[PDB]
């Protein structure tokens, strides 16, 4: 009942960032990706593995298959530097990913 | 030879409607439900539980969209001179049109089934006073529901208030809307640019030459608060009167007071806006 | 002269002229489980 | 809907803290309330969920026996109350609308501002 | 799992309508009738014959009066890996509106 | 003077006033096998 | 397959008269109480154990339970002197009670 995430991902502003979230049979669960800037409540950026909430730019995308979920940030802006969390519901609890700190160079 | 075919319709539970069908777009291959005061579960193909994709149904003329998981019925493999039982579970999702009549305490679906709950039953702003004929645990009003299209696989961005009712035979889901601005006991019938109002014999005569119709009303007005669910009359009357005045009499006449409401023999509600020329 | 609303048969009379109404029959028939049965109870022994 | 929480709390070890979360705009009985806390510089740590319609609750395994989740329907409010505080309970607590009775696959779409609790 | 639910409507004989329902207000717990050219008998709960009181049905809006004897369906007690049969007889009396042309 | 055709309710309005239509319900219900089932296929082991 | 009745019952005009009718499992049968004055055909005073025909005063009452049926006459007037019979249907034949002569003193 745990999700494995890379502690940090560093990507140049022009390129794209991939954030992984590993788990046993995570392909059968809905992975929700939350973004958190320092000193702020988390903001939902991806829900149900492929969908973007209202007001979320087209750059964000998600996938979830087998034993891995992935959040892809295309054209990583300087303001995308934040902590990203993957959340699923396992047994009777929502497990949160360890958090990935995206650094924009 | 078939010794018997037991066909039943089982409801899809709430935790399967939200977590499976709406989230992943798939449906379970096992039906667990209460029938004849007993908990019965049927396994499709007499196999283990599995999630099956909901594929579009075969297209038929003048039919709404539908989705199903299975397309063939499972029958037992042949064993000589024995009675053998085979189970088939087909998860079916059907968009339907539901209709209700006054006093809107119940509605029917396009399949001829009745739902004995008011379409406006819910949990907010006096929706819990509406009629319900089921137990409190058969109904669930989910807020912040993101509907998922089963063909385009595109989640709706705007959250909606979704009522879900688990009747013994099926599970209906519908978007909650407030009752007062949705239904009305009167509908707009005619829009007349020119009804001359004449006072005579202690009565009003509204005569329209365009439709060739004369209505007779009492001198006093009709109280709009006396109309049951009559929140549409005022809005429609104001909108239509403004549109017609802008179309025809904007440059020649001026309105005289707020629109009045009269009741005419035969039961016709006349919203009248008197006009006075610039002279 | 005053003309009153006059009609031989009303809408309600035409609707009642029918011997069987599908909607009313279905409504009465589909309350059978809600009237003569205990839907919610689950018996496990 | 909007979730507004109480102010910051300063307490002593072994005390109890009740954090309040008031919902505005909806009847508040149509969704669930998930309480999740984040420590100073650490990741999100889920605490529990509550169904304000029925009062059903579900806590994390590590918070069982120390978290009580209650509600006041009349005031449209949900309370999370921690007992037996210790030093690592200094965290920002958020109430959100997330999974639970309404569906285990729901998302924490709307959040509260969060209350800072220091022991 | 249900492998089959045979549901039928049997008539109440004349000698039961007058002697039991109209006289004592009760109904027999056994349904003996003719179906498919055969004398078929059903015993409620697979038990002995008994007289059950006809009590009013649950109130439903815009519906006529009705009475019934049983409220719960009888299902067989669990015996592992065996098909089992259970019978339920529910005597129903309904005041109805009849129309003719 | 020209008298235009006027009526309070049309035939369609009166027929739509009914809550359930037997013909439409039957037409939708009897397409169930054609929509959600494969009638033609025969499976023989 | 028989019904037993007391041969005679004597009651004061002010009090109430109670007539018993015994039988095996009489509570499964509809006991009808008939009143017969001398030189007249019997008149039905109680039918279906708890009911009075049209024209029968409210004084009469009936009960049926277990192995006893009971006819109760309240405010027994002088005109109630008659023979009271309890009748049932037992195996293809009606059974009449032995007859109880009520006398007012």
* H or E element in which residue C26 lies: helix C22-30
**Is C37's CB within 8 Å of E73's CB?**
yes
- Each as own residue / partner, the long-range contacts of residues B3-7 (CB below 8 Å, 24 or more positions apart, any chain) are B3/B83, B4/E4, B6/E2, B6/E3, B6/E4, B6/E5
Q: Beta-strand (E) ranges in chain B?
A: 26-28, 30-35, 38-43, 51-53, 55-56, 66-68, 92-94, 99-100, 107-108, 114-115, 139-145, 160-166, 171-175, 195-200, 203-208, 213-218, 253-255, 260-264, 268-272, 275-277
**Is A48's CB within 8 Å of B146's CB?**
yes
Report the 10 Å Cβ neighbour count for B220: 9
Tokens of B103: 């006093």
Tokens of B90: 């087909």
- Distance spanning both ends of chain E, measured CA to CA: 47
Reported resolution, Å: 3.1
Q: Which residues of D touch B122 (CB under 8 A)?
A: 30
Measured between alpha carbons, how far is G42 from D103 in angstroms, rounded to an integer?
76
Whether B118 and B106 have beta carbons less than 8 Å apart is answered as: yes
**DSSP helix/strand/coil, F32:** helix
CA dihedral in degrees (B148, B154, B160, B166; nearest 10)?
-10
Q: Does B157 touch chain A (CB under 8 A)?
A: yes
Contacts of E35 (CB under 8 A, 6+ apart): E8, E10
Measured between alpha carbons, how far is B86 from B76 in angstroms, rounded to an integer?
5
DSSP letter, residue C40: S
Q: Does B37 touch chain C (CB under 8 A)?
A: yes
**Is C34's CB within 8 Å of B116's CB?**
yes
Q: Does B175 touch chain E (CB under 8 A)?
A: no
Q: Which residues of E touch C38 (CB under 8 A)?
A: 71-72
Q: Subunits that touch chain F (at least 3 Cβ pairs < 8 angstroms)?
A: B, C
Contacts of A39 (CB under 8 A, 6+ apart): none
Tokens of G102: 């009520």
Whether B195 and B273 have beta carbons less than 8 Å apart is answered as: no
Q: Which residues of C touch B108 (CB under 8 A)?
A: 23, 26
Measured between alpha carbons, how far is E5 from G58 in angstroms, rounded to an integer?
51
Report the 10 Å Cβ neighbour count for G83: 18
Tokens of D10: 């300063």
**Phi/psi at A30 (5° precision):** -90, 115
Cβ pairs B/F, distance under 8 A: 55
Q: Does E1 touch chain B (CB under 8 A)?
A: yes
**Is B265's CB within 8 Å of C38's CB?**
no
Whether F43 and B72 have beta carbons less than 8 Å apart is answered as: yes
The owner of tokens 């397959």 is G1
Q: Does E23 touch chain G (CB under 8 A)?
A: yes
Whether G105 and G13 have beta carbons less than 8 Å apart is answered as: yes
Q: Could you tell me which of G54, F29, B133, A79 has the C-alpha nearest to residue E60?
A: B133
Measured between alpha carbons, how far is E24 from E54 in angstroms, rounded to an integer?
10
Task: Name the residue in chain F with its Cα closest to that of B65.
Answer: F35
The owner of tokens 């049927």 is B42
C-alpha distances out from residue G78 to G11, G13, G63, Å: 10, 7, 23
Q: Subunits that touch chain B (at least 3 Cβ pairs < 8 angstroms)?
A: A, C, D, E, F
**Is C34's CB within 8 Å of B133's CB?**
yes
Q: Which residues of F touch C23 (CB under 8 A)?
A: 18-20
**Is D94's CB within 8 Å of A41's CB?**
yes
- Do chains D and E touch by CB distance (3+ pairs < 8 Å)? no
Measured between alpha carbons, how far is D104 from G8 in angstroms, rounded to an integer?
81
Rounded to a whole number, what is the largest CA-CA distance in chain D?
37
**Is B37's CB within 8 Å of C38's CB?**
yes
Q: Given the DSSP bridges, would you call strands B99-100 and B92-94 parallel, antiparallel or unpaired?
A: unpaired
The owner of tokens 């999740």 is D36
Contacts of D52 (CB under 8 A, 6+ apart): D28, D29, D31, D32, D33, D71, D73, D78
Q: Does E81 touch chain C (CB under 8 A)?
A: no
**CA geometry: angle F1, F7, F12, nearest 5 deg:** 145
Query: Ramachandran region of residue D76, left (φ > 0), alpha (ψ -120 to 50) or beta?
Result: left
Q: Could you tell me which of B60, B54, B2 has the C-alpha nearest to residue B24?
A: B54
Closest Cα in chain E, distance from residue B215 (Å): 37
Measured between alpha carbons, how far is B39 from A36 in angstroms, rounded to an integer?
45
Q: Which residues of B touch F33 (CB under 8 A)?
A: none
**Is A54's CB within 8 Å of B158's CB?**
yes
DSSP assignment of D23-83: EESS-SSSS-EEEEEEETTS-EEEEEEE-TTT--EEE-GGGTTTEEEEEETTTTEEEEEE-
3 state SS for G2-59: CCECCCEEEECCCCCEEEEEECCCHHHCCCEEEEECCCCCCEEEEECCCECCCCCCCC
Q: Could you tell me which of B90, B139, B95, B89 has the C-alpha nearest to residue B117?
A: B139
C-alpha distances out from residue A95 to A82, C36, D40, Å: 20, 47, 19
Tokens of B102: 């006054």
Partner residue opposite C42 with nearest CB, options B34, B106, B265: B34
Interface test with C, best of F20, F25, F26 (most C CBs within 10 A): F20
**Phi/psi at G69 (5° precision):** -110, 150
Q: Given the DSSP bridges, would you call strands E30-35 and E38-43 parallel, antiparallel or unpaired?
A: antiparallel
**F-proximal residues of C, 2-41, CB under 8 Å:** 11, 22-23, 26
Tokens of A2: 């745990």
Whether A63 and A69 have beta carbons less than 8 Å apart is answered as: yes
C-alpha distances out from residue A104 to A71, A97, A101, B62, B121, Å: 16, 21, 10, 54, 50
Tokens of F11: 């035939």
Q: Does A61 touch chain B (CB under 8 A)?
A: no
Measured between alpha carbons, how far is G84 from G101 in angstroms, rounded to an integer?
7
Identify whether B236 is preceded by a cis peptide bond (ω within 30 of 0): no
**Is B87's CB within 8 Å of E1's CB?**
yes
**Is B24's CB within 8 Å of A54's CB?**
no
Tokens of D35: 């309480």
3 state SS for chain A: CCCECCCEEEECCCCCEEEEEECCCHHHCCCEEEEECCCCCCEEEEECCCECCCCCCCCEEEEEECCEEEEEECCCCHHHCCEEEEEEEECCEEEECCCEEEEEC
Q: Could you tell me which of B61, B75, B59, B67 has the C-alpha nearest to residue B1?
A: B75
Task: Name the residue in chain C with its Cα closest to that of B39.
Answer: C42
| Sheet with B92-94, side-by-side order of all strands | B55-56, B66-68, B92-94
- Do chains B and E touch by CB distance (3+ pairs < 8 Å)? yes
* H or E element in which residue D18 lies: strand D17-24
Report the 10 Å Cβ neighbour count for B128: 13
Whether B232 and B186 have beta carbons less than 8 Å apart is answered as: yes
Whether B136 and B158 have beta carbons less than 8 Å apart is answered as: no
**CA geometry: angle D39, D43, D49, nearest 5 deg:** 80
Closest Cα in chain C, distance from residue F35 (Å): 24
Closest Cα in chain G, distance from residue E23 (Å): 6
Measured between alpha carbons, how far is E75 from B37 in angstroms, rounded to an integer?
8
**Is C30's CB within 8 Å of B114's CB?**
yes
DSSP letter, residue B105: S
Task: Name the residue in chain F with its Cα closest to that of C27.
Answer: F20
Looking at the DSSP assignment, which residues form a beta bridge with residue A95? A88
Q: Which residues of B touch F4 (CB under 8 A)?
A: 210-212
**CA geometry: angle E72, C37, E38, nearest 5 deg:** 75
Expressed in percent and rounded to 5, the helix, strand and coil fractions of chain C are 45, 0, 55
**Is C36's CB within 8 Å of E68's CB?**
yes
Closest Cα in chain D, distance from residue A9 (Å): 15
**Is C42's CB within 8 Å of B116's CB?**
no
Q: Could you tell me which of B2, B12, B28 has the C-alpha nearest to residue B86?
A: B2
* H or E element in which residue E2 lies: none
C-alpha distances out from residue D47 to D43, D64, G68, Å: 13, 9, 70
Q: Does A53 touch chain B (CB under 8 A)?
A: yes
Task: Name the residue in chain G with its Cα closest to that of E23.
Answer: G48
DSSP letter, residue D10: E
- Do chains C and F touch by CB distance (3+ pairs < 8 Å)? yes
Measured between alpha carbons, how far is B107 from D75 in angstroms, rounded to an integer?
33
Looking at the DSSP assignment, which residues form a beta bridge with residue B32? B41
- Do chains G and A touch by CB distance (3+ pairs < 8 Å)? no
Tokens of D62: 């590590």
CA E56 to mean position of chain CA atoms: 14
Partner residue opposite C22 with nearest CB, options F14, F17, F22: F22
C-alpha distances out from residue G9 to E18, G17, G71, Å: 34, 8, 12
**Phi/psi at B17 (5° precision):** -70, -45
* H or E element in which residue F33 lies: helix F32-36
**Is B105's CB within 8 Å of E75's CB?**
no
Q: Does E75 touch chain B (CB under 8 A)?
A: yes
- Do chains C and A touch by CB distance (3+ pairs < 8 Å)? no
F21 burial type by CB count under 10 A (0-12 exposed, 13-18 middle, 19+ buried):
middle
Contacts of B41 (CB under 8 A, 6+ apart): B30, B31, B32, B33, E1
């Amino acid at each position: 009942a745990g999700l494995t995430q890379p502690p940090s991902v560093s990507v140049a502003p022009g390129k794209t960032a991939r954030i992984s979230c590993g788990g046993n049979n995570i392909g059968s669960k809905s992975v929700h990706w939350y973004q958190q800037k320092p000193g702020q409540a988390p903001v939902l950026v991806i829900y149900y593995d492929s969908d973007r909430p209202s007001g979320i730019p087209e750059r964000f995308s998600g996938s979830n298959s087998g034993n891995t979920a992935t959040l892809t940030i295309s054209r990583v802006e300087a303001g995308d530097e934040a902590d990203y969390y993957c959340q699923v519901w396992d047994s009777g609890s929502v497990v949160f990913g360890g958090g990935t700190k995206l650094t924009v160079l | 030879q078939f010794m018997g075919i037991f066909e039943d319709r089982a409801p899809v539970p709430f935790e399967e409607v939200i977590d499976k069908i709406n989230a992943k777009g798939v449906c379970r291959s096992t039906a667990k439900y209460v029938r004849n005061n007993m908990e019965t579960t049927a396994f499709h193909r007499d196999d283990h539980e599995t999630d099956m994709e909901l594929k579009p149904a075969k297209v038929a003329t003048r039919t709404s969209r539908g989705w199903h998981t299975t397309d063939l019925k499972y029958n037992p493999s042949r064993v000589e001179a024995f009675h053998r039982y085979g189970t088939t579970v087909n998860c079916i999702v059907e968009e339907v049109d539901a209709r209700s009549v006054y006093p809107y305490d119940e509605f029917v679906l396009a399949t001829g089934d009745f739902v004995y709950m008011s379409p406006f039953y819910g949990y907010r702003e006096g929706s819990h006073t509406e009629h319900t004929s089921y137990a409190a645990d058969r109904f669930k009003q989910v807020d912040g529901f993101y509907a998922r299209d089963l063909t385009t696989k595109a989640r709706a961005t705007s959250p909606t208030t979704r009522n879900l009712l688990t009747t013994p035979k099926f599970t209906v889901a519908w978007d909650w809307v407030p009752k007062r601005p949705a239904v009305c006991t009167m509908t707009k019938w005619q829009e007349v640019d020119e009804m001359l109002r004449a006072e005579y014999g202690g009565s009003f005569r509204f005569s329209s030459d365009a439709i060739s119709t004369t209505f007779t009303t009492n001198l006093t007005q009709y109280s709009l608060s006396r109309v049951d669910l009559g929140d549409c009359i005022g809005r429609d009357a104001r909108e239509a009167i403004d549109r017609m005045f802008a179309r025809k009499y904007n440059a020649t006449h001026i309105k005289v007071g707020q629109p009045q409401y009269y009741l005419a023999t035969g039961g016709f509600l006349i919203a009248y806006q008197p006009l006075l020329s610039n002279t | 002269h005053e003309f009153v609303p006059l009609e031989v048969y009303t809408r309600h009379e035409i609707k009642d002229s029918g011997l069987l109404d599908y909607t009313e029959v279905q409504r009465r028939n589909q309350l059978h489980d809600l009237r003569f049965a205990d839907i919610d109870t689950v018996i496990r022994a | 809907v909007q979730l507004v929480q109480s102010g910051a709390e300063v307490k002593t070890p072994g005390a109890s803290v009740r954090v309040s979360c008031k919902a505005s705009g909806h009847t508040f009985r149509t969704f669930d309330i998930n309480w999740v806390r984040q420590a100073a510089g650490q990741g999100l740590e889920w605490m529990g969920w509550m169904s304000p319609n029925s009062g059903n609750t579900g806590y994390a395994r590590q918070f069982q026996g120390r978290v009580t989740m209650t509600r006041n329907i009349s005031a449209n409010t949900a309370y999370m109350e921690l007992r037996g505080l210790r030093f690592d309970d200094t965290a920002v607590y958020y109430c959100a609308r997330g999974p639970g009775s309404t569906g285990t696959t729901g998302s924490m779409d709307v959040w509260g501002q969060g209350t800072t609790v220091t022991v």
